Design a binder for these strands. Structure first.
Ligand SMILES: [Zn+2]
Lengths: 136, 131, 176, 38, 141, 94
RNA sequence: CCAGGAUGUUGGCUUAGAAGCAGCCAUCAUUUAAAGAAAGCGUAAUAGCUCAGUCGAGUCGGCCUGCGCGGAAGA
């Protein structure tokens, strides 16, 4: 999966996800999957979403991952009293703001593009929209 | 699908330019016929296998209209097929006449020999003309 | 809509009586009296019957389209008449008609005696073929369906009552 | 038939018809394409 | 020239007169005899040359025998003794493999006097030169 | 080439800008040359289809405001956070 | 709706055999209004289905959006 090979810190606070997103336009490929809803993508959701599109396109073209978890999440198991120290990291998520260019693709037709991201979007928890590279 | 405007203007424009130089253009009904028969009719007229083509009454109407022609609408009723001759004597009427081998005539609605209109009762007159 | 735009013609002798929303089509064979919806507006002019919607209704034409085919078949039934031929495929499957009742032996341990509705007569040119006739297309289609339920042909041999205009596909019996 | 919230048109002979208030998928080339609850 | 009325076509070559291993009873199970495929078949086959896979219609009515009229064989059977090699392509397009030419298959597909559309000896002539290059072969025309 | 009917704005600020987006309209501004900036309110739909063409960002544009054709050029554009709409476009006198 | 829906050619290699319809490739040409070296079912290979002139004016479906639909089964 996708996760920081090294971090200055192991744990991190909650951190609210407010405001819009930055990466809204594609600057690597001709197509790509854009986000519309609000939430967070885990290493599993991102990885699984990549296999879908990457598979719907056999072994041609190229895909990019603009997003990245880089955010540890701690959780306490069952039969555990509240407190007693912060929980332990179980997985890493990535804050996705409305307009975050999730993935991108290039080297394949426009029709095959939607189909690819269509099987990948179903893997994502939040809604998404298909976008095309625009000039300026 | 359909054909774009510019793409249809040429189609009619072509069939019209060939009608201005066509020494003949007989019309008849060709329903229930097979390809083997159509080809045979084409091989008879010209060894090039090209002869007798089916066209709509419209494509022909505006084609016969785009060119100074009149009194031919009656020849355009339902299934219509044209047979013109851009070269050689337009006496190739005997070929198709013998091909249909029909004791009637109705099928061969009308025609236009050398800019001269001719009914269905004249298809035999030209088909019986001596060498 | 479009279908309603095509006025229906009524042959000679075909007496047409309109009473508000009721249509009585009496001709050469039988007499049908159907009641239109309420959004349909039939207009009896010349020797044909036009159809159109009515201000104040949504579907409008959605109803006129049906009323166009309805009365249409009504005229065809009182003129040429409808007919449905159902042949019985299989061994031991015979058929007989004693009056207004049809006896069928579809392997059942007891001969079935289907009762014919209003005006629906049928004979049997063969021990495995029935020919239904009537003036109402809806009825002649229902009766043929009833005898079609007694034994629905299986996709292996087609054994059972079927339709002369029906194509039954079969399949193998699997391997082992 | 296979009933399930999701219903689509598999083959080209598929048809999405509504009856009484329930989306159905009628087929005339493959009884397996028969669906319900859409 | 009419409609459907029996007309199969399964053969391996003109040499094998009514074979068995390749097809056998497969060339006659509806109205053709697995024996008369030498009488009416070789009625003129041995009068020319046996070595080119030549097919043929069937046409059966109900008069026991059949009136099948043999015609021109495939244009590929000329790609093993008229074009060049008989097989062995090695790699599809990763290599130009072999290569035909203009003069080649020129007067070879011309002999056809019972097929081809259009007498234009230029449009119906090159019509038998497409596949000769479609198999990775180069065009020396 | 691309004629875009415009009308000088009567009030600025995000407040007015928002009221424009709620009526199939969006804020704009034409700067450049020695002339002073001018607030402009273009139609959403209209410009929404004009920007669909790459020739809209390449070729010169002609904005008609108060009976005046000002030959400008697309400098920058701000699209909606996630919807296929426009927020504001900057034009330069050229 | 009633129609047509062809031909080179069963395209070449492979194979028991593959012919539009295992699979590698290739995908030009043709007579035309139009027909892909071929969509799905179907054959052991074929066959057989079949999709992509008349009638006479409306039809096709992606996008933005409102209101609804199914998704929705507890004592
Ligand atoms: Zn279906």
């Amino acid at each position: 999966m996708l996760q920081p090979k090294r971090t200055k810190f192991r744990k991190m606070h909650k951190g609210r996800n407010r405001g819009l997103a930055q990466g809204t336009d594609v600057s690597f490929g001709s197509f790509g999957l854009k986000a519309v809803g609000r939430g967070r993508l885990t290493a599993r959701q991102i990885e699984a979403a990549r296999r879908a599109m990457t598979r719907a396109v056999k072994r041609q073209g190229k895909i990019w991952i603009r997003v990245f978890p880089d955010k540890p999440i701690t959780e306490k198991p069952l039969a555990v009293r509240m407190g007693k120290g912060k929980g332990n990291v179980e997985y890493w998520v990535a804050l996705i703001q409305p307009g975050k260019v999730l993935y991108e693709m290039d080297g394949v037709p426009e029709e095959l593009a939607r189909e690819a991201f269509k099987l990948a979007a179903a893997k994502l928890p939040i809604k998404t929209t298909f976008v095309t590279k625009t000039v300026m | 699908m359909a054909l774009n405007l510019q793409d249809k203007q040429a189609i009619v424009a072509e069939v019209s330019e060939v009608a201005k130089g066509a020494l003949s253009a007989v019309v008849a009904d060709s329903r229930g016929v097979t390809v083997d028969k159509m080809t045979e009719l084409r091989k008879a007229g010209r060894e090039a296998g090209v002869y007798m083509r089916v066209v709509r009454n419209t494509l022909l109407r505006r084609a016969v209209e785009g060119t100074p022609f009149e009194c031919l609408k009656d020849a355009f009723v339902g299934p219509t097929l044209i047979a013109y001759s851009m070269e050689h004597p337009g006496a190739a009427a005997r070929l198709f006449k013998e091909f249909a081998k029909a004791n009637a005539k109705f099928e061969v609605k009308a025609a236009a020999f050398e800019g001269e209109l001719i009914p269905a009762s004249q298809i035999d007159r030209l088909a019986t003309l001596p060498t | 809509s479009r279908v309603a735009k095509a006025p229906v013609v009524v042959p000679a002798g075909v007496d047409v009586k309109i009473n508000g929303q009721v249509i009585t089509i009496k001709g050469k064979n039988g007499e049908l009296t159907r009641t239109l919806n309420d959004a349909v507006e039939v207009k009896h002019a010349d020797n044909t019957l036009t159809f159109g919607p009515r201000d104040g209704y949504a579907d409008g034409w959605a109803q006129a389209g049906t009323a166009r085919a309805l009365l249409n078949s009504m005229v065809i039934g009182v003129t040429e008449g409808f007919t449905k031929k159902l042949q019985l495929v299989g061994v031991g499957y015979r058929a007989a008609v004693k009056g207004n009742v049809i006896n069928l032996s579809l392997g059942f341990s007891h001969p079935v005696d289907h009762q014919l509705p209003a005006g629906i007569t049928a004979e049997c040119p063969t021990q495995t073929e029935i020919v239904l006739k009537g003036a109402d297309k809806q009825v002649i289609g229902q009766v043929a369906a009833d005898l079609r339920a007694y034994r629905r042909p299986e996709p292996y041999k087609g054994k059972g009552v079927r339709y002369a205009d029906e194509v039954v596909r079969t399949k193998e019996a699997k391997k082992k | 038939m296979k009933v399930r919230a999701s219903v689509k048109k598999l083959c080209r002979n598929c048809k999405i018809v509504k009856r009484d208030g329930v989306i159905r998928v009628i087929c005339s080339a493959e009884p397996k394409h028969k669906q319900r609850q859409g | 020239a009419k409609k459907v009325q029996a007309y199969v076509k399964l053969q391996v070559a003109a040499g094998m007169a009514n074979p068995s291993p390749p097809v056998g009873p497969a060339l006659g199970q509806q109205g053709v005899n697995i024996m008369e495929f030498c009488k009416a078949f070789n009625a003129k086959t041995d009068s020319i040359e046996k070595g080119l896979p030549i097919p043929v219609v069937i046409t059966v009515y109900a008069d026991r025998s059949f009136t099948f009229v043999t015609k021109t064989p495939p244009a590929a059977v000329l790609l093993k003794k008229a074009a060049g090699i008989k097989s062995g392509s090695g790699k599809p397009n990763k290599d130009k493999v072999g290569k035909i030419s203009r003069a080649q298959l020129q007067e070879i597909a011309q002999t056809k006097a019972a097929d081809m559309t259009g007498a234009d000896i230029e449009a119906m002539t090159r019509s038998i030169e497409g596949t000769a290059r479609s198999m990775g072969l180069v065009v020396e025309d | 080439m691309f004629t875009i009917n415009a009308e000088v704005r009567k009030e600025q600020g995000k407040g007015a800008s928002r009221r424009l987006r709620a009526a199939n309209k969006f804020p704009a501004i034409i700067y450049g040359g020695k002339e002073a900036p001018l607030a402009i309110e273009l139609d959403h739909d209209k410009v929404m289809n004009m920007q669909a063409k790459a020739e809209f960002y390449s070729e010169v544009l002609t904005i008609v405001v108060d009976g005046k054709e000002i030959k400008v050029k697309a400098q920058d554009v701000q699209r909606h956070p996630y919807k296929p709409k426009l927020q504001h476009i900057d034009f330069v006198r050229a």
